[PDB]
Amino acid sequence: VPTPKRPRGRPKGSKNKGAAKTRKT
DNA sequence: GGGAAATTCCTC
DNA sequence: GAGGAATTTCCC
């Protein structure tokens, strides 16, 4: 309700869920 | 102060 | 309606 369009970016306290790293097995 | 990952807004 | 592109934040 305060600002209309939200800016582009990663919210505060957003942790990474899926790791884009390579798996071992 | 740089890099990486995630979310959002805009065009066709 | 759906997809592509751009910007922000956290950690070392």
Copy the structure tokens of residue A16. Answer: 């990474």
A13: three-class secondary structure by DSSP: coil
A9 vs A12: CA distance, rounded Å:
9
Q: How far is the CA of A25 from the C1' of C2 (A)?
A: 35
User: A21 beta carbon < 7 A from strand B?
Assistant: yes
Which protein residue has its CA closest to C1' of C9? Answer: A10
Determination approach: NMR
User: A16 beta carbon < 7 A from strand C?
Assistant: no
Task: Count CA atoms closer than 13 A to A16's CA, side-chain side.
Answer: 4
